[PDB]
Amino acid sequence: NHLGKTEVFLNRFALRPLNPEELRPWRLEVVLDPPPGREEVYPLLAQVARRAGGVTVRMGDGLASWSPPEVLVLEGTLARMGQTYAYRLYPKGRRPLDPKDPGERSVLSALARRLLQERLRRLEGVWVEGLAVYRREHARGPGWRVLGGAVLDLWVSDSGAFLLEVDPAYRILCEMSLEAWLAQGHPLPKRVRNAYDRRTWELLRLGEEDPKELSLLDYHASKGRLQGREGGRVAWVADPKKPIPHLTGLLVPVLTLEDLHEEEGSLALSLPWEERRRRTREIASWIGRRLGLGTPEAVRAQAYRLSIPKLMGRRAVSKPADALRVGFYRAQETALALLRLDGAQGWPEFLRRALLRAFGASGASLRLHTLHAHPSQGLAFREALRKAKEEGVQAVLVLTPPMAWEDRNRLKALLLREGLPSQILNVPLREEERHRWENALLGLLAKAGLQVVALSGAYPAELAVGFDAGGRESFRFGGAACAVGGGHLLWTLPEAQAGERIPQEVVWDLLEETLWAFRRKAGRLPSRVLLLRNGRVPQDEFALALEALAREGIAYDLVSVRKSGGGRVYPVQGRLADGLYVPLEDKTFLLLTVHRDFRGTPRPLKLVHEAGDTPLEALAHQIFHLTRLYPASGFAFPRLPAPLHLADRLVKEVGRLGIRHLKEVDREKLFFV
DNA sequence: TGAGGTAGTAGGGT
RNA sequence: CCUACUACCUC
Ligand SMILES: [Mg+2]
Secondary structure (H helix, E strand, O other): OOOOOEEEEEEEEEEEEOOOOOOOOEEEEEEEEOOOOOOOHHHHHHHHHHHOOOOEEEEOOEEEEOOOOOOOOOEEEEEOOOOEEEEEEEEEEEOOOOOOOHHHHHHHHHHHHHHHHHHHHOOOOOEEEOOEEEEEEEEEEOOEEEEEEEEEEEEEOOOOEEEEEEEEEEEEEEOOOHHHHHHHOOOOOOEEEEOOOOOEEOOOEEEOOOOOOOOOOOOOOOOOOOOOOOOOOEEEEOOOOOOEOOEOOOEEEEOOOOOOOOOOOOOOOOOOHHHHHHHHHHHHHHHHHOOOOOOOEEEEEEEEEOOOOOEEOOOEOOOHHHHHHHOOOOOOOEEEEEEEOOOOOOOOHHHHHHHHHHHHOOOOOEEEEEOOOOHHHOHHHHHHHHHHHHOOOOEEEEEEOOOOHHHHHHHHHHHHHOOOOEEEEEOOOOOOOHHHHHHHHHHHHHHHOOOOOEEOOOOOOOEEEEEEEEEOOEEEEEEEEEEEOOOOOEEEOOOOOOOOOOHHHHHHHHHHHHHHHHHHHHOOOOOEEEEEEOOOOOOHHHHHHHHHHHHOOOEEEEEEEEOOOOOOEEEOOOOOOOOEEEEOOOOEEEEEOOOOOOOOOOOOEEEEEEEEOOOHHHHHHHHHHHHHOOOOOOOOOOOOOHHHHHHHHHHHHHHHOOOOOOOOOOOOOOOOO
């Protein structure tokens, strides 16, 4: 059925409906010299849009502006990664822009963004950075300070009305010159900024160069930039590249959490949701005060409390860790090997037992083996592994002191090559460090292929598969996928074959390889699948996949999941509740999969039903439950549903180790967690 | 390498 | 929007 109904506020504020003049922006035409180049045209126009000044943005192969064509710089010259271009703008009249047409709507909103940006630029006595305005001094420290404000946004809606988005944020500013910053003691400025203006850079190094040798220190003097400041050492900055000689005294370090890391105290940049809601309401009211588009009106929305997930081990469990005592769901016979990289010998008693306590409490048996080779023994080590694999060892638990990145990846790849997933557990280890080692054991077992916990319930889709791209914007250069159920997890790696196969073939490739591995492990071929992707890549990339599912007669649902851009969700009454579903413009909605502390504010996932007929609540419900099926955590659930959280980790590990043909590892052994 | 969350910054004329 | 890292917490 369905439960709960609640009302919430979105960190959005409704404003004045667009007036006739805005709905029909002026349409300018751009002429370049020399011609751009097939791929350089779009960004080049964006650049002319800025160069021409005013509330002007790119619309198609030209600009669209809200500023009178007369105030814009109709001619000029701009450079791009070398070549410079002369531009010409020809008013081509006015063009209505239907808000109902997402695509045209995309331009009015772009203009709304430029309009909002323009007001901040003329704001007095407030630090501005893009669409963020910082209006209050929060924390402090030697030479540095922290400002508080909000990242802002403005866009036109379905209805054709303005929308203001406000999300509180903190900014880190240095109040000390690079010369004085180094004096103190601090080191590396990744980027830096002119003490006199705002152009940020990426200082390369400090050159032991020429006092005043035309002139460097004179140039900065031919402007007074240097009067009463003491240009220090020769510093070569950078831009997105010429070496632009400079003085470390006319530069200000751009700090990160690091610089201010070691600190003048603990530093909490997170906000409990009420304080967060409080500042949003306030700043929204403050900006609307000088935006002149009416009073911002908090948009409310209907929310629904989704039914909690029934996480089942052998008995009922509240989190994965608890199955170590209750027993796991179904459990195979298994064997694990211990590999000690320090100087100790066997299995730590409390570990031996915990495993023993977990397995006995479960059905089947376990055997603990101990490898007696050392990675350095080379070939003797490999035969030792081949030999462990022979007697049935399924996964290796590695006790060792913290390992350097590359040593770590070398040991894992080496073991993986002999068909052995491994789990590292850092050796200075006490029995009281319950969380750390119990988590390690959860991983080891998962790597062994054991289904520690499963979902007890009913779901539209029998198989759920998450996809992640090998090239960030497309599956052109391969990628990975993972699938959860019965519910037994498995990974899928692309068909090894190189270059640029067609994207949709790579995708369909992933899905068919997943549909197969499922069958050879469940003996059955799912009747309905839930497909999950990130939204980063097009969608037409899943076309071959979709109708392939058409021929085999299996039903589907394509749902995209965004980690951010979901804004914020606050109740009108009561406390933030877990398992919150919030419908928006349709085919899309919000989901609050977690809320686990009160020193922070939850970040809703934003989803889009891009294909399929299953009802949105039904989608929300399942995607929420998939969230409790990650095996490697045990003390806290991920925000992303298991399938996507797993695939990303798989894509990460693939790159970190150097996987091509993981040929001896079973597909239900989550070697990558 | 224990791992999850919320956050801030790097990153996609001199 | 995505990644990366970092900090801060939490189990
Ligand atoms: Mg792991």
